[PDB]
């Protein structure tokens, strides 16, 4: 009943900004995205809980989110390390939608980004899979405090995480 959606919470400097949830098409994606569940309320224990961004560029995209811990699982995939890829029946549409960044071949991994602009053009070698449900206002303040090259006047923090509904 219904797609199971996930919200996230963004920080910054320790201070609080707003909340943003993603629909995710894990119909569309029964297995990429059929992980994120578990990943998204730490239920599989690996869940990061609490990280934060590696580049922001306020133009062009932001990526920079994985969960590698000293545990021993790393940032690629929930039940192993990388997966041969499904399909991409998602079309390319949103000024920020939701994918993945990995080395492409069989290889859909758990790297991620938020994306400010339409680029449609990085399709075709990853598998796209999510959207923006609620909470863009803040996708938008987030692409202010950064910097066009790659370090941000401030730090994104976790807060919290799990299942909206």
Not at 99 to 111: I, Y
Request: net charge neutral; proline share 4%.
């Amino acid at each position: 009943m219904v797609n199971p959606t996930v919200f996230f919470d963004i920080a910054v400097d320790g201070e609080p900004l707003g909340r943003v949830s993603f629909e995710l098409f894990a119909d569309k994606v029964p297995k990429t995205a059929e992980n994120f569940r578990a990943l998204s309320t730490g239920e599989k224990g690996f869940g990061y809980k609490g990280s934060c961004f590696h580049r922001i560029i306020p133009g062009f995209m932001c990526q920079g989110g994985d969960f590698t811990r000293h545990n021993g699982t790393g940032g690629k995939s929930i039940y192993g390390e990388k997966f041969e890829d499904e399909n991409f029946i998602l079309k390319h549409t949103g000024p920020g939608i939701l994918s993945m960044a990995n080395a492409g071949p069989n290889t859909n991994g758990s790297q991620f980004f938020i994306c400010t602009a339409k680029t449609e053009w990085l399709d075709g070698k990853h598998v796209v899979f999510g959207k923006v449900k609620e909470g863009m206002n803040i996708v938008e303040a987030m692409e202010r405090f950064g910097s066009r090259n790659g370090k941000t006047s401030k730090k994104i923090t976790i807060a919290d995480c799990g299942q909206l509904e």
